[PDB]
């Protein structure tokens, strides 16, 4: 694996929270890594780790960092501009990042945009947070169980859909893993246990991804994003929020979560330096 | 790089598609090609039935007209729709093979859904007809509104002209959808469906012709395996009447925006006329 995109067809589930600790655990394993922001209106993940540049330098303290890099020197405005510009912007990105990293993470936003189906046309690992309700379930299509038949595809499976046939097109005879995140909500209710379980699981058969375990919707990761941190990036000597045992608990999901996605043996380690700094 | 191979699909099975179908498939017998017609609607057959009727009525009378070669997947293709998805393209595949070996055109009529056989059709379509009736929940077949909702049959389509670009042919496959009107459509309405199949049509890849109305003398002919191009003086087992004369003309203008006007017999003694 190189190239990571993290995507889905809405924003959220998380999918920022999710993009910056697969950075950063790759990074504490001793990887190059690029991160691009495709999401040119917000820009969560860049500035993320703008965050991180900033206050590491105010702390005068080191951390790993990405190579972070933009479409343009304004990618706010870029969002505005016609679509040949936004391609432009991110070939060049594109060829920069894979001159100089060994994996290249890409948060993309979905809709029907050119840049969102080409950097899905260059991912080896498609990583898609979802969060575990019908109405998200809908964002990957629809599948009859009246024969398991697919009845309605979605727009985010046929950017997936897209991206798979740029990247045979390409030459590239390495299949592309699609792995969908699933976040448990704290609202779900008893009634819809059975049918969540049966409806993801005819999905990922006839939509053709495979199941993970995603985040949990958590205060701590908003606390943390001011300053740029991770939870791996915790320790007695870097805590500008007060450690506890959520922090602990959202360490064991990423664990689980790395290890879907294959990447456990690229990570950082997961003394105990997060319980250190309890 | 002529058109060989001509898919007509939809969604639900509607919109007069085996009427059109059959009538593109005689068209092209009387302009002097050999046609080979593979009915992939494998529960109803409507299209290998017409041409049954055909035969068995040809049989009775002593009566020349031309015939395609009609070819089934098995011994029994009712009975093959419950069979497992590799027994059906097995069956597709031999068909096909005898298809292109012996015909210059091949008519695939198919069902739409979700199957291996529908989807290896499209993908060896040159050209893909998709009968749709003109209005907004029928346009819903082919996708939503930015696209916000794609389509199982539009991702038919797209799926065929993939599999199409990765068999290494370089020409590209003509999709187009043929808008049946209809007579409960209000003049009011018109502007409004003709924006929706526009941007329908920009963003999904298609380009738009005329289909054929729902008329009643086309399931008066199917029991005789007949089309409009079959009537004269000596083929007339139904009452020839204007509608049939409206209908040729309807046929003429469906097959110009097929790009096979000038491969069809004819859409000098106007035969149907004479027949009236």
Known sequence: ?????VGNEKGGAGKSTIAVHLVTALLYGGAKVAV???????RTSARFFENRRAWLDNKKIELPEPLALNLSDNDVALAERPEEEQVAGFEAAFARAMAECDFILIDTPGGDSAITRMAHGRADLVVTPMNDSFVDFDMLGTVDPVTLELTKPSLYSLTVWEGRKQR?????????????????????????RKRLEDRLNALAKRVGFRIGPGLRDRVIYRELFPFGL????????????????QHLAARQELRALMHSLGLSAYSGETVDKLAAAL
């Open 168 to 192: 045979a097109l390409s030459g590239q005879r390495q299949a592309m893993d699609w792995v969908v995140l699933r976040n448990r909500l704290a609202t779900t209710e008893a009634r819809n």
């Open 230 to 245: 991770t939870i791996a990036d915790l320790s007695p000597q870097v805590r500008p929020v007060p450690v506890s045992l």
């Open 1 to 5: 694996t190189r190239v990571i995109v």
């Open 36 to 42: 691009i922001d495709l999401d040119l209106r917000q």
